[PDB]
Amino acid sequence: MVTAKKDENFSEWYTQAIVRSEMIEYYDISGCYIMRPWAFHIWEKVQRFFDDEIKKMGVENSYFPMFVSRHKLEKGFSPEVAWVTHYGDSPLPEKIAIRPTSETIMYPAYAKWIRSHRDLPLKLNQWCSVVRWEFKQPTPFLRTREFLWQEGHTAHATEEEAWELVLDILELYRRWYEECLAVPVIKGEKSEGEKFAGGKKTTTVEAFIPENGRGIQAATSHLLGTNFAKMFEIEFEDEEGHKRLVHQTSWGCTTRSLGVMIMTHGDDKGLVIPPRVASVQVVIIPILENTGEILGKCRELKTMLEKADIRVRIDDRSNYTPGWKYNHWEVKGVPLRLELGPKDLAKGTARVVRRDTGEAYQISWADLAPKLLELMEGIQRSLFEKAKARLHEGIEKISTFDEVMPALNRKHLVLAPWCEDPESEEQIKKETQKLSEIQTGAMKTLCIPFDQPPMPEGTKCFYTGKPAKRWTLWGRSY
Amino acid sequence: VTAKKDENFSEWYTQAIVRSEMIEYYDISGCYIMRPWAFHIWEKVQRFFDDEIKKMGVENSYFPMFVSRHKLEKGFSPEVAWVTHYGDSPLPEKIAIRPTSETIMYPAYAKWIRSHRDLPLKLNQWCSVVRWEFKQPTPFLRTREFLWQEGHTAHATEEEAWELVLDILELYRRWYEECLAVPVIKGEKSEGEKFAGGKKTTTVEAFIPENGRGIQAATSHLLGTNFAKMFEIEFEDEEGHKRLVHQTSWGCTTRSLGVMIMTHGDDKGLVIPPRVASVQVVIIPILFKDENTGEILGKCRELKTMLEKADIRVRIDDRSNYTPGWKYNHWEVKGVPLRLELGPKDLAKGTARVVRRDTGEAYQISWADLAPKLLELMEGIQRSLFEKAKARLHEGIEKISTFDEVMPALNRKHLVLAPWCEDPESEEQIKKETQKLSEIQTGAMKTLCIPFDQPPMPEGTKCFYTGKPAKRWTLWGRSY
Numbered sequence A: 001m002v003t004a005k006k007d008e009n010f011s012e013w014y015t016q017a018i019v020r021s022e023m024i025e026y027y028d029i030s031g032c033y034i035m036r037p038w039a040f041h042i043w044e045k046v047q048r049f050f051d052d053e054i055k056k057m058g059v060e061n062s063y064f065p066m067f068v069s070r071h072k073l074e075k076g077f078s079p080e081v082a083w084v085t086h087y088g089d090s091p092l093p094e095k096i097a098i099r100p101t102s103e104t105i106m107y108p109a110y111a112k113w114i115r116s117h118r119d120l121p122l123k124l125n126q127w128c129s130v131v132r133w134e135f136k137q138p139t140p141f142l143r144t145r146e147f148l149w150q151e152g153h154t155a156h157a158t159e160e161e162a163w164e165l166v167l168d169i170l171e172l173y174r175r176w177y178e179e180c181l182a183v184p185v186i187k188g189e190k191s192e193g194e195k196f197a198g199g200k201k202t203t204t205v206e207a208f209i210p211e212n213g214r215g216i217q218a219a220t221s222h223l224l225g226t227n228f229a230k231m232f233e234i235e236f237e238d239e240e241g242h243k244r245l246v247h248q249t250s251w252g253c254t255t256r257s258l259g260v261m262i263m264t265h266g267d268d269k270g271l272v273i274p275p276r277v278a279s280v281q282v283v284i285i286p287i288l289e290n291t292g293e294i295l296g297k298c299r300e301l302k303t304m305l306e307k308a309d310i311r312v313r314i315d316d317r318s319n320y321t322p323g324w325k326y327n328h329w330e331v332k333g334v335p336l337r338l339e340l341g342p343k344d345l346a347k348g349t350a351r352v353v354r355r356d357t358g359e360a361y362q363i364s365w366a367d368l369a370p371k372l373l374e375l376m377e378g379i380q381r382s383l384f385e386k387a388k389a390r391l392h393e394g395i396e397k398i399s400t401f402d403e404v405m406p407a408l409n410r411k412h413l414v415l416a417p418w419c420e421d422p423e424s425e426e427q428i429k430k431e432t433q434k435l436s437e438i439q440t441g442a443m444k445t446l447c448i449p450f451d452q453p454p455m456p457e458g459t460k461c462f463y464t465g466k467p468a469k470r471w472t473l474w475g476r477s478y
Numbered sequence B: 001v002t003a004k005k006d007e008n009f010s011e012w013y014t015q016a017i018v019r020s021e022m023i024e025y026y027d028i029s030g031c032y033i034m035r036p037w038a039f040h041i042w043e044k045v046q047r048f049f050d051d052e053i054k055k056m057g058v059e060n061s062y063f064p065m066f067v068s069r070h071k072l073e074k075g076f077s078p079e080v081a082w083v084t085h086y087g088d089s090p091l092p093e094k095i096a097i098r099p100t101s102e103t104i105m106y107p108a109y110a111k112w113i114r115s116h117r118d119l120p121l122k123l124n125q126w127c128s129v130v131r132w133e134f135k136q137p138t139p140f141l142r143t144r145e146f147l148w149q150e151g152h153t154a155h156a157t158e159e160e161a162w163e164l165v166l167d168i169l170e171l172y173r174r175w176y177e178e179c180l181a182v183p184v185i186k187g188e189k190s191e192g193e194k195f196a197g198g199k200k201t202t203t204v205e206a207f208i209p210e211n212g213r214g215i216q217a218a219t220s221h222l223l224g225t226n227f228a229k230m231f232e233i234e235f236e237d238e239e240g241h242k243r244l245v246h247q248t249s250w251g252c253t254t255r256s257l258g259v260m261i262m263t264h265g266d267d268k269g270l271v272i273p274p275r276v277a278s279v280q281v282v283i284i285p286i287l288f289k290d291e292n293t294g295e296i297l298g299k300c301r302e303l304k305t306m307l308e309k310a311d312i313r314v315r316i317d318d319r320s321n322y323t324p325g326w327k328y329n330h331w332e333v334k335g336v337p338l339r340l341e342l343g344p345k346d347l348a349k350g351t352a353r354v355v356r357r358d359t360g361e362a363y364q365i366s367w368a369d370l371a372p373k374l375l376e377l378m379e380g381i382q383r384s385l386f387e388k389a390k391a392r393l394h395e396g397i398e399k400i401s402t403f404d405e406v407m408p409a410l411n412r413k414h415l416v417l418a419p420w421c422e423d424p425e426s427e428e429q430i431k432k433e434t435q436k437l438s439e440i441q442t443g444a445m446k447t448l449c450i451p452f453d454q455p456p457m458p459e460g461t462k463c464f465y466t467g468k469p470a471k472r473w474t475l476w477g478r479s480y
């Protein structure tokens, strides 16, 4: 049973929810966690969605090695990578790192494979795990030392084609969150200080966690331009015979998405899993003395529902009371519970309870499959709409810096007109950190949203008083 | 490809996998890049196997890639890769990259399993593992990092665990025979060849005629209660008594792709069985001197739509910057089962010319007949690839009765099926003797498996090596 209340002790609530729902197991190596089937099935669902979509775009999957040579990674202080230095008791002549990302593994191959315009575009993806051995405190799903992800890497003859792909991928990430996970996200461009330094422009989808007021980056898609093509000599002869640099993109999204989903939809009773990704969509709980009447009808119902492609489990485990099973599956977040006891059997009905609201329905056995499909569609949409309402309520539009600290104290983000000077972003981070100290606490840019309201002529930047350029979203962050 | 498969087999294999764009080389020895053309086949067999194990109630999971020194070694270290530093700082205790996940998963199993209500526990994961052997690698077959799936189950009874071992082994037979069209032999490993941590190891074995070697294709172990004792995986039964779980584990890797390549490839390159071909039919418009360009391209689009309506996986190669002859050779070296050519004449005739990759046979087919006729041809290709490979397997196994027949059979690049007493001392002696005789003429012959399909053992039959009473017919040969 979940005892910590989500609004009062959010961090303990999160730990309880992910452990008692059987999503994670702890491990002796800090920063690494076991992903149990209840969570892994959600990853499998989003992976299938995204993989099907990128295949429609002509992206093909591949698999590159998990190791990169020291001289290829460092193309005098090491990055925060895990170094393999020995095989058995024998030192390697040159240490090798576990991939933190695969640019330095893939791009030498791209340089070999690309020789002429005929070879472009080149569009590859891989599903793997990466390792980033940061010394800070980990958080399951959200910030871990090893994590599962997909990384896409493309090369094109023109920047326009590369940018088109950047935006198509970002739209797929919006769909991953909004359509599969029912989590609303905001598409935007990263500031110069926050973008990937190896690239030209970084686009992002950002999510908001109301309980701690923090934004979190949900996925990323980069227009790399020609920087990496210069560094790796990825050149092609054009249709007229001149050597040119390719224009590249890269993009990724991780199991952080599951953590965002958990935090968005969970409640005081535990998880709430959107029907589109739930391992089990309907749990059948026989109200049981096993004559065979009740479980016979349950097996018939499960067969029937599975013909409608509903993911069903009958919980016929012994020595647990019905109420125990009800709470067990509520903590796990199954979106629908189907109760079948003796009175139900006598009437030819079943009692269906939806997890998000607790509303109960008496449904005849015949109406079961269509009514349950309808209810799952309603649950999915209601989860999304309520989360989107909370997102809207969490963003305050401001004009001057003196509004910032009140908004941050309300656990809100701010949308502010900004001159986009990177010096000013560093100054704002320092000032908000120190104001929080006197009163991390730093506010930073989350993104410059694609959806720009008009910028009235003469609008001043909320911090510098210089002419504002764009409306920018700021907040405390992960 | 220019090397002949029947002359320089290793060189043929390297040319086949490079020129088909299946692999790319890499600067760290023993690791290779799996390019999209190879990864497509992997995706097909992964989907088959994952669908089937899900039907059995096995659920996917993901455990960490790292194992602490004290948990792995629960002296001289094993052939694992050791992480010793994060950045410039030494780890307080070094950690290994997984070579397999027993030591990572089983402490969790011990925590999770409390009563019979928790059993059976059936988990699988798709991942890569690392085995840092000092020997020469071979792409797909023997590499230092490789992709695989490892399944690990726990049961209340040995009977249930053994039933699962055999169900999984049958899935591996289907992975090879139904998907890859590679015939395999199910069997039990000898005492000297089985997984030491388990009670009985079952296997599927394939045969490579060009070098006379058996190769283990996949494995499924009855672990019994050994790991349950080691990791304290116990459960309370219905009577309230504490008992040990009965476990299984099982795995299969991208070695399967290399076995497919070696089995079906020919002097022209790869031959992909239709059931694992991401492109089953390639349509090639013959464009020359601007003769009917628009008509030909429109018709190719129509044909692709029609064939896709029949679930045939079709690609039109309308790339303007390659000639038709180049396209012919490209898709042939890549092993696409069927090539469909449509030129000006064919547009006039209402026909298309189709060539099958395995035999080269050509067919003129009316556009209306295309879908059913191509389905029929793909069934024929899949069946023929399997049947020819099975005939080669049959021809490569000699039944023997005495050790004096062994060296002539090995020199014919064959396996031997011999009656054996099953004494491990005798397997060790046979390995040494056959290596020595080979040297005089690696060359050691070992057991590959004791097949499930046992012919009768006539009373009084003597072991082919020791002269003691034979127990079972055993398959032996040179091996990978």
Ligand SMILES: Cc1cc(N2CC[C@@](CO)(C3CC3)C2=O)cc(C(=O)NCc2cc(F)cc(-c3cnn(C)c3)c2)n1
Pocket (backbone or CB within 6 Å): A031, A132, A133, A134, A135, A136, A137, A138, A139, A141, A142, A143, A144, A145, A147, A149, A217, A218, A219, A220, A251, A252, A253, A254, A255, A256, A478
């Ligand atoms: C699961 C995951 C996802 C992502 N990212 C980033 C990119 C993105 C965006 O969505 C996606 C690929 C594109 C994503 O998912 C980043 C990390 C991560 O930085 N891990 C290392 C680590 C370990 C640790 F023990 C502690 C901390 C730590 C503690 N405090 N701070 C400030 C850091 C960090 N981890």
Ligand SMILES: Cc1cc(N2CC[C@@](CO)(C3CC3)C2=O)cc(C(=O)NCc2cc(F)cc(-c3cnn(C)c3)c2)n1
Pocket (backbone or CB within 6 Å): B030, B131, B132, B133, B134, B135, B136, B137, B138, B140, B141, B142, B143, B144, B146, B148, B216, B217, B218, B219, B250, B251, B252, B253, B254, B255, B480
């Ligand atoms: C791809 C793959 C698959 C399997 N196995 C084994 C089990 C099985 C059976 O099918 C499946 C999981 C159950 C499978 O696929 C074993 C290896 C492997 O031993 N790698 C290490 C290595 C690296 C290296 F550079 C050289 C050598 C080397 C050279 N000569 N010798 C005698 C060894 C070995 N590799």
Ligand SMILES: O=C(C[C@H]1NCCC[C@@H]1O)Cn1cnc2cc(Br)c(Cl)cc2c1=O
Pocket (backbone or CB within 6 Å): A079, A080, A081, A100, A101, A102, A103, A132, A133, A150, A151, A152, A196, A220, A250, A251, A252, A253
């Ligand atoms: O990983 C990236 C850039 C992009 N790679 C492709 C997938 C999407 C992703 O945003 C940025 N990044 C992030 N963290 C890193 C940590 C280390 Br350690 C190293 Cl060496 C390198 C990096 C590093 O390059």
Ligand SMILES: O=C(C[C@H]1NCCC[C@@H]1O)Cn1cnc2cc(Br)c(Cl)cc2c1=O
Pocket (backbone or CB within 6 Å): B078, B079, B080, B099, B100, B101, B102, B130, B131, B132, B149, B150, B151, B195, B219, B249, B250, B251, B252
């Ligand atoms: O890996 C195994 C046994 C089984 N594990 C589950 C998947 C199927 C597989 O056959 C045997 N094995 C093989 N090679 C190994 C190499 C090293 Br290095 C280590 Cl430490 C351990 C092992 C080791 O245990």
